[PDB]
A paper describes a structure:
The process was repeated to determine the sequence of the 33-residue Lyba2 as DSCSEYCSNRCPSCDGQTQTQYTLCCINICCPS. The four disulfide bonds are formed by Cys3‒Cys26, Cys7‒Cys31, Cys11‒Cys30 and Cys14‒Cys25 according to the X-ray structure. Cys3, Cys7 and Cys11 are located in the N terminal loop, which is stabilized via disulfide bonds with Cys26, Cys31 and Cys30 of the π helix. Cys14 is situated at the C-terminus of the one-turn 310 helix and connects with Cys25 of the π helix (molecule A) and α helix (molecules B and C). Instead of the α-helix – α-helix cystine stabilization found in thionins or the α-helix – β-sheets stabilization in plant defensins, the (α + π)-helix in lybatides is stabilized by four disulfide bonds located in two turns (the β-turn 2–6 and the 310-helical turn 12–14) and one loop (7–11) in the N-terminal portion of the peptide. This is very likely caused by conformational stress induced by the disulfide bonds at the C-terminus (Cys30 and Cys31). The majority of its interactions with peptide copies C and C* consist of water-mediated hydrogen bonds.
Lybatides are cysteine-rich and highly constrained peptides. Alignment of lybatides revealed that they contain eight highly conserved cysteine residues arranged in a unique spacing of C-C-C-C-CC-CC, with a sequence identity of 76.5% between the two. Disulfide mapping of lybatides revealed a novel disulfide connectivity of CysI‒CysVI, CysII‒CysVIII, CysIII‒CysVII and CysIV‒CysV.
Author numbering: 1 to 32
The structure:
Amino acid sequence: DSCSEYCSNRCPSCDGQTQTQYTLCCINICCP
């Protein structure tokens, strides 16, 4: 979690969401 699926950095603030919102958070906010 914390964007481990998509990123080398970590953003736990993306946790706790439904799937598309999680993915958006990770790829556009955590590690664009």
